[PDB]
Design a protein around this nucleic acid. Structure first.
Length: 341
RNA sequence: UGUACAUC
């Protein structure tokens, strides 16, 4: 199975083995854990002629290496450090196989690497091969990373078909383990005509989204990178619900982002909501202080409050300072207070 | 004291 050269090599019989000495054996070495390492190492600093010798033996069977547990690394190295002609020739070997590779445990890494290094004409051609398979890829553990890379690297106008597929399914996808990732990449890189519809569906489903295991990240994302009009719509959904959501494992993260990224006015309103509102005998703020998640929202409020408003919070907290010590999460508020005394 | 994101 293994050639004498490869076996003898794994048996450490060639401490000084050079690329040029494995002529004829590139494919075999590329598919071998140690040989693949040997080649990768040797490549970054090989001479163009050495690099070309290695290339000559992998071009024809390049696909075989792209879906290989060790070979995929040798392909990638050519995309990173090979010549322009070598990258173009590798792209040609991918033609017709993008879907198959994008779903592939190792091939998907080659697709991702290629997207980063090839000219836009080739990028665009790779993308078109996913035409009619958007959701299949977005929902695949290998493929979603490829769709993400496309969005990061490819001209946004060529990605219109991905948008088309998302239209009407933004809620479903935003609560998906992989789809929430792709939605965020879209918000970052896509055109206004493309992000708009997507933002519309996110706004329609904010209540549900802030409480979702994966959806909360998409709403947080808009709060940190979104336009003010989009942040405010989200903030308006949190208003009147500060107490309840900040007690929630997932949504409490979103109320922190609202506190942090809201306008001056919106921030003052959210903090006042829980200084004013009473949860039974005492303030909403006091219930929050004792909560496993809500105690985090309080601290964030102390962090970002205007000095004047911070004084009001500290005053709301002060009367409970000795009782806070009796509560697992209460204790944590005291730690915060030291900083401010 | 608290939630996601993949190869030698």
């Amino acid at each position: 199975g293994r050639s004498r050269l490869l076996e003898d090599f794994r048996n450490n019989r060639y401490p000084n083995l050079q690329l040029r000495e494995i002529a004829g054996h590139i494919m075999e070495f590329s598919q071998d854990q140690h040989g693949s390492r040997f080649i990768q190492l040797k490549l970054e600093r090989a001479t163009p002629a050495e690099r070309q010798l290695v290339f000559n033996e992998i071009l024809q069977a390049a696909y075989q290496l792209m879906v290989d547990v060790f070979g995929n690394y040798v392909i990638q190295k050519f995309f990173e450090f090979g010549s322009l002609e070598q990258k173009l020739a590798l792209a040609e070997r991918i033609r017709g196989h993008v879907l198959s590779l994008a779903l592939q445990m190792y091939g998907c890494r080659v697709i991702q690497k290629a997207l980063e290094f090839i000219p836009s004409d080739q990028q665009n051609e790779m993308v078109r091969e996913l035409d009619g398979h958007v959701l299949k890829c977005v929902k695949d553990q290998n493929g979603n990373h490829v769709v993400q890379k496309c969005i990061e690297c490819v001209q946004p106008q060529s990605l219109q078909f991905i948008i088309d597929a998302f239209k009407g399914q933004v809620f479903a996808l935003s609560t998906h383990p992989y789809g929430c990732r792709v939605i965020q990449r879209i918000l970052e890189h896509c055109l206004p005509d493309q992000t708009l519809p997507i933002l519309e569906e996110l706004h329609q489903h904010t209540e549900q989204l802030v409480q979702d295991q994966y959806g909360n990240y998409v709403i947080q994302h808009v709060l940190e990178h979104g336009r003010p009009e989009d942040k405010s719509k989200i903030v308006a959904e949190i208003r009147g619900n500060v107490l309840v959501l900040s007690q929630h494992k997932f949504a409490s993260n979103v109320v922190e982002k609202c506190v942090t990224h809201a306008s001056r006015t919106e921030r003052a309103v959210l903090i006042d909501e829980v200084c004013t509102m009473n949860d039974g005998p005492h303030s909403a703020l006091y219930t929050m202080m004792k909560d496993q998640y809500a105690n985090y929202v309080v601290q964030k409020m102390i962090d970002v409050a205007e000095p004047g408003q911070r004084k009001i919070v500290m005053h709301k907290i002060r009367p409970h300072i000795a009782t806070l010590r009796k509560y697992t999460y209460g204790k944590h508020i005291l730690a915060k207070l030291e900083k401010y005394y």
